[PDB]
Amino acid sequence: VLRDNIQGITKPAIRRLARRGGVKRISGLIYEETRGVLKVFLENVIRDAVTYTEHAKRKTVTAMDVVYALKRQGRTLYGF
Amino acid sequence: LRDNIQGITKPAIRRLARRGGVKRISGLIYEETRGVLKVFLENVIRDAVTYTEHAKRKTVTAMDVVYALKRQGRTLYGFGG
Amino acid sequence: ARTLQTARPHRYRPGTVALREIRRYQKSTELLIRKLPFQRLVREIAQDFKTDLRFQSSAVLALQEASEAYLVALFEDTNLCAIHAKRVTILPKDIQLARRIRGERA
Amino acid sequence: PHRYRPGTVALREIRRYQKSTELLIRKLPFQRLVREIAQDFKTDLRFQSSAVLALQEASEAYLVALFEDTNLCAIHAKRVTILPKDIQLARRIRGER
Amino acid sequence: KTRKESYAIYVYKVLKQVHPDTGISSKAMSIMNSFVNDVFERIAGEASRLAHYNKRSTITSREIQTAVRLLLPGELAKHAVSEGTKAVTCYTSA
Amino acid sequence: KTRKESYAIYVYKVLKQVHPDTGISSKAMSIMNSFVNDVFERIAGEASRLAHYNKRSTITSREIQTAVRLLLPGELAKHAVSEGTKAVTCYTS
Amino acid sequence: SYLFRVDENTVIDATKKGGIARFINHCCDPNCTAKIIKVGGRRRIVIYALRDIAASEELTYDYKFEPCLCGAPNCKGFLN
Amino acid sequence: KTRSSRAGLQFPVGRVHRLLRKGNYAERVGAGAPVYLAAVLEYLTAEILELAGNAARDNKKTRIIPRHLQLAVRNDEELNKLLGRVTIAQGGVLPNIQSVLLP
Amino acid sequence: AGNAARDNKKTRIIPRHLQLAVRNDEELNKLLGRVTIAQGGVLPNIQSVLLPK
DNA sequence: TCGAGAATCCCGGTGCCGAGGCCGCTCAATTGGTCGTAGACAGCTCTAGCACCGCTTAAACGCACGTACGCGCTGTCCCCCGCGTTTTAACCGCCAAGGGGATTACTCCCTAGTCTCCAGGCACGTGTCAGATATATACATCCGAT
DNA sequence: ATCGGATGTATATATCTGACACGTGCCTGGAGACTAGGGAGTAATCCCCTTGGCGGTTAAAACGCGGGGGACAGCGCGTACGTGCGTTTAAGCGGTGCTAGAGCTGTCTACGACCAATTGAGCGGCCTCGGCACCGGGATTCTCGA
Ligand SMILES: C[S@@+](CC[C@H](N)C(=O)[O-])C[C@H]1O[C@@H](n2cnc3c(N)ncnc32)[C@H](O)[C@@H]1O
Ligand SMILES: [Zn+2]
């Protein structure tokens, strides 16, 4: 099993994401907050992805399952 | 029927804002709010009138408004939905 | 020991009548806009789409309901923005920020 | 000797990153994270290759977008830094909480 | 006159078994009716979409279960699926 | 092997009219295919609901017109309804 | 005394028969109140939570009887 | 004589008629519904490919990549509303910096 | 809704009681996060920065 | 710190209208039986997701310094609130009319459905040039001293 | 503001592949033709309910004013954030191996659509009284100035 892998989202990665979004001076407590937010988003999407997989009696999470999970939440995605 | 938006007077906006939970209104809100409300009303009545003239009739029913609302994400319970 | 029971001029400072109107409106459930002005406003806006419609009397009412449940909700959000900026008043630059973040302007 | 003024490398990085389209988060640790979050819903999960990336792509367009809003909230308070009480407002206004 | 239909009498039969003495108003009855219609449409539409991705040609008692488990939140899902499967068992063995 | 149909060739035929010497990559063609699918599903769903409301069963060229007027924004609606009526006219003769 | 006054000409007596609601003590500061609902057309005594109550907390309640082992920070020496 | 050529189109009116029939939309698909729908789809894909090619040209390239579709859509004002919630993959962000930040 | 209408000393479920029953829950609130219940009013709530000191 | 006065809740008395039960009367749900086919299932093929290994090298971490911005405080001034007086039109009740929304009655024409016939679009190779590096160099921006 | 330089970025030439664009078979989805049938278009008509107008009244809006609380500007303190440099570390890339499980095909049958006769559930119209809105008069709380 795996555990405490959320720490792989490093400080420079969040920093670069903020820089793309337009930020210029990131606080210090942000990294933990965005790690929590990203974890929540990922949980909510993978729940529906796994439900869509289970329904079809499969054991591989297809790409169309992730696309449908995202579409079902009002966040469509072009390219898969 | 010209210049009726002044019918959404100041006390009505005050009461809406009180129910919203705000405590100390500014003085310029009472025009931004009329603009917002006019935009919302145009966006809804456009689809209501589309729904009502697609069915070849000249009377905006309540089902037309319910559909025009449900279509923009904002449903509405109570009027025959 | 005894049987227990359940029963046996002026000028308010600014900011108190507001905190009372808030409590008396957040518990009532009627419509907060006059009905004839909203009637006329709906009829006047629907001119730009088709000339002579008849607006069945439950349509108008319907709109009014939504038109409240939108504005009220909007104000809630704007309130937070004000409280976020370390103030108490709500300003037009708060409504615009709420509508931008929320997706209505982009 | 020489030292760029504090904060002037920020805008250079801003322009450098807003112009490209690469993926900002490292791919393998993100694969591990997504692969272990789904351990709470099943166990013999396989995660077809183009699915993970899919997720990752979406999971960037979220965060970036969120920061685009966080900044606004910061700028609303006559500020520059984005303190963690901005993300919370930016997530409560759009109904995500 | 033309006879239109609703869920009035069934909502009333449920109210008269959850609160055997309360009584619903009229506007509240119309609200509950439109609520039932809205949830019906949500669930049946998601069930259809789901019975389409899989290329099945029918909308069975399992598309409905997965739809209920997607749309309904965390804990309402478990109780909803329990009531559903109980009803389906009690119905098939009769 | 396995036959899967897509809107690649039609998107290419249209590209060769709007820009006779450019060429779409693979990812961009996948994106355009997904875009066409999305818009088709939106318009079809809205026309379906719009036929269900008036208690009909034929989904004719009036429902598609009204659905284009509902979905597409201000200006795109006008040009889209114009192209549509022009094509149905040039087809019914 | 475990007597309780429903109205002017009727009282509840829980000295020998009743619920565990006979195990709620009088406190100068209460966190629960007692209202009189009417279900089925008859009056009954219900106990509502006045203020939020945490776990493993004693349920205080004001008797209004009209000595006091109150033990409250602010408190009066009489149940009467 | 395919039913698309008879209308002066490039989209497959036959395939769109088939999809409308086999998608469980209504009981009886009309006659001039697939023509209308194919014409609308063709107009939209042309309107987006034109700006995509324009954007790809100014950047001195002859191949359209997702960056150029992102630019073409988000720069427009009525396509940005149509595709208001999509996230074009490998698309990136439109360059913009708040005025308060730059010195 | 009946619990609310009883704890409010009435005996008729009424739109305000449905609005209360929904918005006071936590999961019935996500199922109906977008709806608006006509004649349901709003839930009593005042921020803490506003309450006097 | 406590009086007072303004607002709020709670207890009876009263009228009225809509929530609920009752009666006839449909028409749609029930039951039985047939029949075609959607899908279950056993089985086989093959691809692609998983795991490991070795190098290298770019990205991550720790550390130091210094300085820009958060922030807490103080101080004006100004404008939004609470309240009283005057003015308006919303609202309620009522009457009259006629448009058009439903409903009914015919009829016909537009589409499903089936069979026949074949050409267009999709998997599969093959070719080459468009774009990605890579290097050298010129020009732009930025920072210290004055 | 002025240079001087130092770092970074943009410009242009060389070259190097791999992914796009084109030509080929070939398989089945699309086009033609014809029929039957029911869904939609059209005429009659009727009565609901929308529109329009009018008088009273009184609730709510409009206006003006006094002032106290709040928004906004201006400074010092200090810390926590950015920038640069020298380390570590594990990401990435390439190459191998392999086995799980997606995917596709043929056989069989259990299940849902379809159709006929019917009959009782529920839907519309009629009362009707009890719950609720309204009014009035107590107690009971809260705010504010002293
Ligand atoms: C409902 S009984 C409380 C139950 C009691 N603790 C028991 O063990 O049964 C209330 C009675 O308990 C006693 N009591 C309750 N609260 C008290 C208090 N605060 N001080 C003194 N006696 C108290 C009095 O005799 C009072 O009449
Ligand atoms: Zn005591």
d(Cα H74, Cα H65) in Å, to the nearest integer? Answer: 15
What pairs with residue I21 in β-bridges?
none
User: Which residue type sits at D83?
Assistant: L
Domains and CATH numbers, chain E: 1-94 (1.10.20.10)
* CATH fold group of domain B1-81: Histone, subunit A (1.10.20)
Minimal CA–CA distance to A9: which of D17, D25, C22, D11? D25
**Residue I20 · residue I2 · CB < 8 Å:** no
Phi, psi at F4, each rounded to 5°: -130, 125
DSSP string for I11-48: SEE-HHHHHHHHHHSSSHHHHTSS--BTT--------T
**Residue F39 · residue H42 · CB < 8 Å:** no
Q: Which residues contact H87 (CB under 8 A, 6 or more apart)?
A: A75, A76, A77, A78, D57, D58, D61
Q: Using a CB cutoff of 8 Å and minimum separation of 24, what contacts does A47-54 make?
A: A47/D41, A48/A72, A48/A73, A48/E70, A49/D38, A49/D51, A50/D38, A50/D41, A50/D42, A50/D45, A51/E66, A51/E69, A51/E70, A52/E50, A52/E53, A53/D45, A54/D42, A54/E66
- Which run of H or E residues covers position B44? helix B29-54
Bases on strand K under 7 Å from any protein CB: 6-9, 19-21, 28-32, 39-40, 49-51, 60-62, 67-72, 80-84, 90-92, 100-104, 112, 122-125, 131-132, 140, 143-145
Q: How many residues are there in chain C?
A: 106
How many Cα atoms occupy the beta-carbon half-sphere of C69 within 13 Å? Answer: 24
G29: CA distance to ligand 1 center in Å? 15
d(Cα H68, Cα F19) in Å, to the nearest integer? Answer: 14
User: Which residue type sits at G64?
Assistant: K
Specify the pairing of strand G3-7 against strand G10-13: antiparallel
Q: Is G63 labelled a binding residue?
A: yes
Residue among E17, E21, E31 with most chain I CBs within 10 A, to mutate: E31
G22 lines ligand 1 (CB under 6 A): yes
Specify the pairing of strand G32-39 against strand G42-49: antiparallel
G51: CA distance to ligand 2 center in Å? 19
What pairs with residue G48 in β-bridges?
G33
Q: Distance, in angstroms, between H1 CA and closest chain A CA?
A: 34
Count of CB atoms within 10 A of residue D20's CB? Answer: 12
Maximum Cα interatomic distance, chain C, rounded to a whole number of Å: 80
Chain CA centroid to CA H66, Å:
13
Q: Distance, in angstroms, between B80 CA and closest chain F CA?
A: 13
G26 lines ligand 1 (CB under 6 A): yes
Count of CB atoms within 10 A of residue H15's CB? Answer: 15
Phi, psi at G31, each rounded to 5°: -115, 5
- Which run of H or E residues covers position D67? helix D49-76
Residues of I in contact with E31 (CB under 8 A): 15, 18, 37-38
Q: What tokens were used for D37?
A: 């979050």
Phi, psi at C2, each rounded to 5°: -150, 165
Q: Distance, in angstroms, between E52 CA and closest chain A CA?
A: 11
Bases on strand J under 7 Å from any protein CB: 5-8, 10-11, 18-21, 27-28, 38-39, 48-50, 59-61, 66-71, 79-84, 89-91, 99-104, 110-112, 120-124, 130-131, 142-144
> What is the extent of the structural domain holding H49?
1-103
DSSP-assigned letter for residue C49: T
Q: How many residues are there in chain G?
A: 80
G70 lines ligand 1 (CB under 6 A): yes
What ranges do the domains of chain B cover? 1-81
Count of CB atoms within 10 A of residue D86's CB? Answer: 26
Count of CB atoms within 10 A of residue C11's CB? Answer: 5
Minimal CA–CA distance to D32: which of A15, A49, A8, A37? A8
- Who among residues 22-41 of F has its Cβ near strand K, under 7 Å? 23-27
DSSP-assigned letter for residue G61: B
Chain CA centroid to CA I29, Å:
10
Is residue B19 exposed (0-12), middle (13-18) or buried (19+ Cβ within 10 Å)? buried
How many Cα atoms occupy the beta-carbon half-sphere of G69 within 13 Å? Answer: 1
User: What is the torsional sign of CA B62, B67, B72, B77?
Assistant: positive
- Per DSSP, the three-state class of B77 is strand
- Per DSSP, the three-state class of D77 is coil
* Strand K contact with C27 (CB < 7 A): no
In total, how many domains does chain D have? Answer: 1
Residue among D5, D11, D24, D83 with most chain A CBs within 10 A, to mutate: D24
Q: Which residues contact B20 (CB under 8 A, 6 or more apart)?
A: C71, C72, C73, C74, C75, C76, C78, C79
Separation of first and last alpha carbons in chain D: 50
d(Cα E40, Cα E33) in Å, to the nearest integer? Answer: 11
Specify the pairing of strand E23-24 against strand I12-13: parallel
Residue located via tokens 């201000």: F74
d(Cα F79, Cα F85) in Å, to the nearest integer? Answer: 10
In the structure, ligand 2 is a single-atom ion and the residues with CB under 5 Å from it are: G 28, 68, 70, 75-76
Q: Which residues contact I16 (CB under 8 A, 6 or more apart)?
A: C29, I39, I40, I41
List subunits contacting chain C, requiring 3 or more Cβ pairs under 8 Å.
Answer: B, D, G, H, I
Q: Which residues contact E49 (CB under 8 A, 6 or more apart)?
A: none
Does a structural domain hold residue C40? yes
d(Cα D89, Cα C28) in Å, to the nearest integer? Answer: 28
Q: Distance, in angstroms, between G75 CA and closest chain I CA?
A: 24
Residues of G in contact with I7 (CB under 8 A): 37, 48
Minimal CA–CA distance to C59: which of H80, E81, B41? B41
* Strand K contact with A3 (CB < 7 A): no
Residue nearest to nucleotide J5 (CA to C1'): C10
Helices of type H across chain F? 8-18, 26-53, 61-71, 74-91
Q: After which residues is chain A broken (C to N over 2.5 A)?
A: none
Q: How many residues are there in chain D?
A: 97
* Strand J contact with F5 (CB < 7 A): yes
d(Cα I8, Cα I4) in Å, to the nearest integer? Answer: 6
CA of C7 to C1' of K131 (A): 25
Residue of D nearest to C79 (CA): D93
Q: Distance, in angstroms, between C6 CA and closest chain G CA?
A: 6
Is residue H16 exposed (0-12), middle (13-18) or buried (19+ Cβ within 10 Å)? buried
**Nearest-atom index, ligand 1, CA of G71:** 19
Does a structural domain hold residue C1? no
d(Cα E15, Cα I6) in Å, to the nearest integer? Answer: 14
**Residue H35 · residue H44 · CB < 8 Å:** no
d(Cα F13, Cα A38) in Å, to the nearest integer? Answer: 42
**Residue D54 · residue A67 · CB < 8 Å:** yes
Residue among C26, C60, C67 with most chain I CBs within 10 A, to mutate: C26
- Who among residues 58-87 of H has its Cβ near strand K, under 7 Å? 63
- Per DSSP, the three-state class of C41 is helix
Please check whether residue D87 touches C, CB under 8 A: no
**Residue B47 · residue B73 · CB < 8 Å:** no
G62 lines ligand 1 (CB under 6 A): no
**Residue D40 · residue A2 · CB < 8 Å:** no
Phi, psi at B48, each rounded to 5°: -60, -45
Phi, psi at A26, each rounded to 5°: -90, 135
Superfamily of A1-80 according to CATH: Histone, subunit A (1.10.20.10)
Q: What tokens were used for D25?
A: 């988060």
**Residue F67 · residue F48 · CB < 8 Å:** no
G34 lines ligand 1 (CB under 6 A): no
B–D contact (≥3 CB pairs within 8 Å)?
no
Per-residue HEC secondary structure of C52-104 comes to CCCCCHHHHHHHHHHHHHHHHHHHHHHHHHHHHCCCCEECHHHHHHHHHHHCC
Is residue F58 exposed (0-12), middle (13-18) or buried (19+ Cβ within 10 Å)? middle
Query: CA distances (Å), G20 to each of G23, G26, G34, G47, in order?
Result: 5, 15, 15, 12
d(Cα D21, Cα H87) in Å, to the nearest integer? Answer: 13
Per-residue HEC secondary structure of H30-75 comes to CCCHHHHHHHHHHHHHHHHHHHHHHHHHHCCCCEECHHHHHHHHHH
In total, how many domains does chain H have? Answer: 1
Phi, psi at G12, each rounded to 5°: -95, 135
d(Cα H90, Cα H70) in Å, to the nearest integer? Answer: 9
Q: Which of H66, H67, H98 faces D75 most closely, judged by CB atoms?
A: H98
d(Cα D12, Cα C95) in Å, to the nearest integer? Answer: 33
User: What is the torsional sign of CA I43, I48, I50, I53?
Assistant: positive
Q: What tokens were used for G69?
A: 């082992």
* Strand K contact with C5 (CB < 7 A): no
CA of E8 to C1' of J28 (A): 18
How many Cα atoms occupy the beta-carbon half-sphere of E93 within 13 Å? Answer: 5
Q: What tokens were used for I46?
A: 């005042």
